[PDB]
């Protein structure tokens, strides 16, 4: 989810956002197809 949500949608920015509000993640992207939403 997170904005990503899947390939429907897809914003990659809202799961980058959404890892940006977590402790020290400097952004995140769909690992698989939208659906899931990995920070690093």
Do not use: M, R, T
Not at 30 to 36: D, E, H, L
């Amino acid at each position: 989810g997170f904005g990503c949500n899947g390939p429907w949608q897809e914003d990659d920015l809202k799961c980058h956002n959404h890892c940006k509000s977590i402790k020290g993640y400097k952004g995140g992207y769909c690992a698989k197809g939208g659906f899931v939403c990995k920070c690093y």
